[PDB]
Design a protein around this ligand. Structure first.
Ligand SMILES: Oc1cccc(O)c1
Length: 172
């Protein structure tokens, strides 16, 4: 199928979520032509919807907050697909507040998963990996479990005030 069978439902959903959350969102879709196995298109919808929800809820800041921090007033959400080899790569990127890595660390210490000394030398990717720990947080463990049932991989990149990029790699 073209991935557009999934991507064509997101403009309405993002718009309804942005309206519910009183948030101004510039939503852009690219690579909707990208074709992949029907089993993927039937299952990739729900995980991508979760990621779009997360970006709009926890990521994108309200216009007035963006203006106070000197950002472009309306936040941007980009959903993309492309071919890489015999994989498909799907990206959800926002220019919102990003993931607070210091908050992750604090929570991880509170949950007994690491001590303060070990937290000081963690890389950014080991920190962000805490989000995939079942109910660490949102929902990144359940997104992971679906991608994994499709034999895909997922990664997250994030920087404070810069934004967040989640990338899903799928086989075929
Ligand atoms: O902007 C964000 C923040 C948190 C999780 C997410 O998938 C996106």
């Amino acid at each position: 199928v073209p991935i557009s069978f999934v991507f064509n439902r997101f403009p309405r959903m993002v718009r309804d979520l942005a309206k519910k959350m009183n948030k101004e969102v510039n939503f852009i879709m690219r690579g909707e032509d990208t074709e992949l196995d029907r089993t993927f298109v039937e299952e990739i919808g729900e995980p991508l919807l979760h990621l779009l929800r997360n970006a709009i809820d926890h990521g994108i800041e309200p216009k007035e907050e963006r203006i106070a921090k000197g950002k472009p007033p309306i936040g941007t959400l980009i959903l993309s697909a492309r071919h890489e080899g015999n994989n498909v790569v799907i990206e959800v990127e926002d220019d919102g507040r990003g993931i607070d890595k210091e908050k992750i660390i604090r929570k991880a210490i509170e949950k007994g998963l690491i001590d303060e000394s070990k937290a000081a030398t963690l890389s950014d990717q080991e920190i962000l990996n805490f989000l995939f720990v079942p109910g660490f947080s949102v929902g990144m463990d359940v997104v992971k479990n679906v991608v994994e049932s499709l034999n895909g991989s997922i990664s997250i990149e994030s920087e404070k005030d810069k934004g967040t990029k989640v990338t899903i790699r799928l086989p075929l």
